Enzyme design. Sequence first.
Site, PDB file in Angstrom:
ATOM      1  CG  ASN A  57     -30.055   8.222  -9.716  1.00  0.00           C
ATOM      2  OD1 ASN A  57     -29.180   7.687 -10.408  1.00  0.00           O
ATOM      3  ND2 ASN A  57     -29.919   9.450  -9.215  1.00  0.00           N
ATOM      4  CG  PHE A  58     -29.140   4.402  -7.716  1.00  0.00           C
ATOM      5  CD1 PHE A  58     -30.176   4.772  -6.859  1.00  0.00           C
ATOM      6  CD2 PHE A  58     -27.918   5.079  -7.625  1.00  0.00           C
ATOM      7  CE1 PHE A  58     -30.006   5.798  -5.946  1.00  0.00           C
ATOM      8  CE2 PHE A  58     -27.744   6.104  -6.717  1.00  0.00           C
ATOM      9  CZ  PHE A  58     -28.793   6.470  -5.873  1.00  0.00           C
ATOM     10  CG  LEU A  59     -30.086   2.464 -16.168  1.00  0.00           C
ATOM     11  CD1 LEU A  59     -30.909   1.188 -16.256  1.00  0.00           C
ATOM     12  CD2 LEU A  59     -30.479   3.424 -17.267  1.00  0.00           C
ATOM     13  CG  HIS A  84     -33.397   9.046 -29.580  1.00  0.00           C
ATOM     14  ND1 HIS A  84     -32.356   8.684 -28.752  1.00  0.00           N
ATOM     15  CD2 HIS A  84     -33.156  10.324 -29.953  1.00  0.00           C
ATOM     16  CE1 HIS A  84     -31.518   9.695 -28.636  1.00  0.00           C
ATOM     17  NE2 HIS A  84     -31.981  10.703 -29.355  1.00  0.00           N
ATOM     18  CE  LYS A  85     -34.312  -0.270 -34.210  1.00  0.00           C
ATOM     19  NZ  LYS A  85     -34.160  -1.756 -34.224  1.00  0.00           N
ATOM     20  CG  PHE A  86     -37.331   2.798 -25.429  1.00  0.00           C
ATOM     21  CD1 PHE A  86     -38.469   2.013 -25.247  1.00  0.00           C
ATOM     22  CD2 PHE A  86     -36.905   3.625 -24.389  1.00  0.00           C
ATOM     23  CE1 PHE A  86     -39.173   2.050 -24.046  1.00  0.00           C
ATOM     24  CE2 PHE A  86     -37.600   3.673 -23.184  1.00  0.00           C
ATOM     25  CZ  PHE A  86     -38.738   2.883 -23.010  1.00  0.00           C
ATOM     26  CD1 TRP A  87     -34.819   7.077 -24.914  1.00  0.00           C
ATOM     27  CD2 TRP A  87     -36.745   7.543 -23.877  1.00  0.00           C
ATOM     28  NE1 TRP A  87     -34.661   6.767 -23.581  1.00  0.00           N
ATOM     29  CE2 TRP A  87     -35.830   7.048 -22.924  1.00  0.00           C
ATOM     30  CE3 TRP A  87     -38.031   7.908 -23.455  1.00  0.00           C
ATOM     31  CZ2 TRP A  87     -36.163   6.908 -21.574  1.00  0.00           C
ATOM     32  CZ3 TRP A  87     -38.359   7.766 -22.114  1.00  0.00           C
ATOM     33  CH2 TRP A  87     -37.429   7.271 -21.192  1.00  0.00           C
ATOM     34  CG  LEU A 118     -29.824  10.959  -4.000  1.00  0.00           C
ATOM     35  CD1 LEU A 118     -30.008   9.811  -3.020  1.00  0.00           C
ATOM     36  CD2 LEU A 118     -29.313  12.217  -3.287  1.00  0.00           C
ATOM     37  CB  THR A 162     -30.586  13.540 -14.112  1.00  0.00           C
ATOM     38  OG1 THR A 162     -30.206  12.560 -13.140  1.00  0.00           O
ATOM     39  CG2 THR A 162     -31.359  14.675 -13.470  1.00  0.00           C
TER      40      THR A 162
HETATM   41 NI    NI Z   1     -29.797  11.186 -30.410  1.00  0.00          NI
END
Ligand code: NI
Lengths: 422, 8
Positions: free
Chosen positions: A136-138, A5-8, A422, A172
């Site tokens: 949401n809705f990404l 996970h680069k970003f996270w 949703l 989520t």
């Molecule tokens: Ni992973």
Amino acid sequence: AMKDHKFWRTQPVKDFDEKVVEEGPIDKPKTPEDISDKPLPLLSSFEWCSIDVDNKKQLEDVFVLLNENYVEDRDAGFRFNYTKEFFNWALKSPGWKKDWHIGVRVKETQKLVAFISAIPVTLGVRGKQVPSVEINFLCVHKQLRSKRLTPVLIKEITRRVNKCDIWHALYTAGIVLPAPVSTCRYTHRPLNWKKLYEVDFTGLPDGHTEEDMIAENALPAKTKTAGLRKLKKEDIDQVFELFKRYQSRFELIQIFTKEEFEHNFIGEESLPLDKQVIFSYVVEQPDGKITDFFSFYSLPFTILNNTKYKDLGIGYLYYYATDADFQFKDRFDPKATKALKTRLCELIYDACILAKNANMDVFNALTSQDNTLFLDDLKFGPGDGFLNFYLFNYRAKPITGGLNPDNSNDIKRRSNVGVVML
Amino acid sequence: GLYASKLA
Ligand code: NI
Ligand code: NI
């Protein structure tokens, strides 16, 4: 899974296997002024943009993109079918802003290519109130993926939120990311069976043959519970205290205001049933008392894998509540669970009826809340998907997601995830 | 999240 996970790896998130002992914010306190008052840097040819839901064209673009690019090539004929109605409901919660419904349009073609949404919510995490946003809705166009734009979008949505003094969010995701707070599973209850095997959304067991299929999934054409009316503005004051009273059992929840409660369960008036989104019902007593309430919303798929069809009706179990066990002091008491279980089976049984009657072909639930008490019984069939709940910039101990170690439902402890996305 | 899910 753990280090890819680069970003996270750089974000204010609980890390994998973190033993949280004291829950709370991750980053050290910040204020809106020590937050760049200017959007992040976009690809040279791209440009930012807000989305005014009230704007016909602007919203028109959004669902087109989401209808074309929301499915990730495991075709069975489906394409999501977001409607203007759906988004008018989802994107106009009390507190929304065009800023927060961000997208990315190519500087010249003006064709929207990416989108991510944020709406303000107050969260309840084990009793602590947490001013937040819900994400949401990404979505990104298929010929723009694997190019790591998403993190840009996540940084830009965070900036705009942070600039409004909101430092947390609940999101989520299916894929596993650093820090799920809980995980639940999707179960699907067939309504228009034949139509499902037909579209391939349901398998057919050789030794239970098609005839027995439809025969088992069968369902009354009218509900069966006394007082089962439907939600009206007048009911609010009362159903809100019932809903509030019932949700207090969970550790993760959205702390609705009466405004967002009203907005959430009573949708646009005068909408054909061919275009309605939210379905809220309530049980009243001669006494004048509302003791039950439940809701589900509609989100269909367009089709291509079938010649007789071009659409598929899908309903999701949203929020609900009852006063069955309000007599018991301990929720998990053997008898306390007695009440609660049968009632939910009743209510949800009628919810499945109202659903097929409303033209849904399959009802989806999520092992969250106590959907586990009725999921297997009312025969909801466990599916491929799983949902992970995340809290941005917030450290919280794991919450029971209604799953057993083998991904079997846990009729025992059920779940504490009080929110539904949703 | 995403949604519909599948099963066999
Ligand atoms: Ni992973
Ligand atoms: Ni409203």
